[PDB]
Amino acid sequence: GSSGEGQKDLKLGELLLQKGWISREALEEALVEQEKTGDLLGRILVRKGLPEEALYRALAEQKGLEFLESTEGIVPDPSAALLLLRSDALRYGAVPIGFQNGEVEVVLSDPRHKEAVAQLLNRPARFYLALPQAWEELFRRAYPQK
Numbered sequence: 001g002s003s004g005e006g007q008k009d010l011k012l013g014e015l016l017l018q019k020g021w022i023s024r025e026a027l028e029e030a031l032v033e034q035e036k037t038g039d040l041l042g043r044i045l046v047r048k049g050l051p052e053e054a055l056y057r058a059l060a061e062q063k064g065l066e067f068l069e070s071t072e073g074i075v076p077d078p079s080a081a082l083l084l085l086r087s088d089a090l091r092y093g094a095v096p097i098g099f100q101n102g103e104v105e106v107v108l109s110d111p112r113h114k115e116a117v118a119q120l121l122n123r124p125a126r127f128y129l130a131l132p133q134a135w136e137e138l139f140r141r142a143y144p145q146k
């Protein structure tokens, strides 16, 4: 529904700090590592021991994406599978499932590029953010064999 506990969307790292997912030092550590590694603060922060669900959950709050409680519940369809292919889905990291409100529902494991494809499609589509473990398996759901 709705949540609010004096959170701050000032920065990705801060967003997690407000919730208390990572230690104050964890943020600085991941940040400093990004300057030497040049990787994503999120993926680099995970090294501290942060769960994927948390790293992705924050991305949805900062990127304003819609996170999926799960994948097993999702109901895939053939029509949606026509939008993107198995290999093509990996090209952008998105996978269709169905349509709602005259829009195309596509679950991708990359909210950062959500706008990249959203702008390329030039059409009304609902972009969700699901874990890499659930999003990967979803491929079998959206792309049923035979």
Ligand SMILES: Nc1nc2c(ncn2[C@@H]2O[C@@H]3COP(=O)(O)O[C@H]4[C@@H](O)[C@H](n5cnc6c(=O)[nH]c(N)nc65)O[C@@H]4COP(=O)(O)O[C@H]3[C@H]2O)c(=O)[nH]1
Residues within 6 Å of the ligand: 010, 011, 012, 013, 014, 015, 027, 031, 034, 039, 040, 041, 042, 043, 044, 055, 059, 062, 063, 109, 110, 111, 112
């Ligand atoms: N002092 C400080 N600085 C901070 C903190 N958080 C971030 N930063 C620095 O700002 C840039 C920009 O970060 P944004 O908050 O604009 O957001 C991220 C995020 O949207 C996305 N990202 C980051 N990590 C991941 C990831 O693991 N997966 C995905 N899908 N997207 C990810 O990229 C932008 C860019 O952020 P960067 O991590 O490239 O760099 C940060 C920090 O340099 C903070 O708390 N404190």
